[PDB]
Each structure stands twice: as structure tokens, then as C-alpha cells.
Amino acid sequence: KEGYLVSKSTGCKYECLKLGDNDYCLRECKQQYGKSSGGYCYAFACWCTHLYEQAVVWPLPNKTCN
Secondary structure (H helix, E strand, O other), X not given: OOEXXXXXXXXOOOOOOOOXXXXXXXXXXXXXXXXXXXXXXXXXXXXXXXXXXOOOOEOOOXXXXX
16 A cells, blocks of 8 residues: 555656655645555655555656656
């Protein structure tokens, strides 16, 4: 129930503000995946957790952007 956050327009997302604990990625997940969802910056952009099992996520080991 996890993955890399897919964009509204661009496929891949834009880059993150802060590594470690932050609000910047958590708000960015909660507006795609519902208010109970979690998230963190994986290295470059926001990754999300505690998702619904039918949720859509970007294929980071098949496509590269960040």
C-alpha cells in the first residue's frame, strides 16, 4: 500500500523541500490519496504510504525523471 506520487499533468512529480520528517510531502500525498495517507521524500521527490489498494503510483524502476 505504497508508491511514488503521480503528477496532475507531468507523469513524474517535482522535487522535494526537505529530507527526513516534513509537512511538504505529507500534504502533497493527502491531496491525492485521502486524509489518512502518509508520505516522505525518497531521495528527490515525494513518496506516499498507507494507500488504498486500487491507488495509482508512478513506475520508478521502469521510467526515470528525477
